[PDB]
Swiss-Prot record:
This is High mobility group protein B1. The chain holds residues 82 to 165 of 215 of the full protein. GO terms for biological process: actin cytoskeleton organization; activation of innate immune response; apoptotic cell clearance; autophagy; base-excision repair; cell morphogenesis; cellular response to interleukin-1; cellular response to interleukin-7. Multifunctional redox sensitive protein with various roles in different cellular compartments. In the nucleus is one of the major chromatin-associated non-histone proteins and acts as a DNA chaperone involved in replication, transcription, chromatin remodeling, V(D)J recombination, DNA repair and genome stability. Proposed to be an universal biosensor for nucleic acids. Promotes host inflammatory response to sterile and infectious signals and is involved in the coordination and integration of innate and adaptive immune responses. Its main location: nucleus. The gene is Hmgb1. The lineage of its organism: Eukaryota, Metazoa, Chordata, Craniata, Vertebrata. Residues 76-90 are annotated as: LPS binding (Lipid A).
Amino acid sequence: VQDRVKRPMNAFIVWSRDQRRKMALENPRMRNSEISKQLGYQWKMLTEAEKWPFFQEAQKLQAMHREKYPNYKYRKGETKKKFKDPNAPKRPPSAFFLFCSEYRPKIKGEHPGLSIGDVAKKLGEMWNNTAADDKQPYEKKAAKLKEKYEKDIAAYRAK
DNA sequence: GGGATCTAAACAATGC
DNA sequence: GCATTGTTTAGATCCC
């Protein structure tokens, strides 16, 4: 495990590698902290047009990497929540699931021969049909709850 | 359980 | 190792 196979470098690292070297040239003091600090800054300040193809480098990396190694590979070096976390804070209900809940009684209405779990399948195809603007309110609702959820996970980190 | 998208802790590497 | 932020991973999310 110590000689763990290197995980596919995320797009940030790709950029960081060549950028850091250039930065060392341009910046006279080139302090590790200072170089990297603004380095990450510029990255997130970059345009998505730049991110996309950089992300593709990482995507191709992980694609070949994951298939290459059958068993030996990056395991989630997590921590307490490495296994099934008994008391993980409850995330905001997913927009899809919110829509599913709303249509659940309706689906059985369409066909009086569906198990409650099977009604989700109906939602699945309607999910694609659902207009982005129409589904947006649900997602926003979850996003608002997400802020609340972060407080919950913060409590998890420290009471 | 059930489809079908989602989340957060932790790690991923360069050049000093 | 640092700091930056991105991919990792594997449960997690609805009602009945």
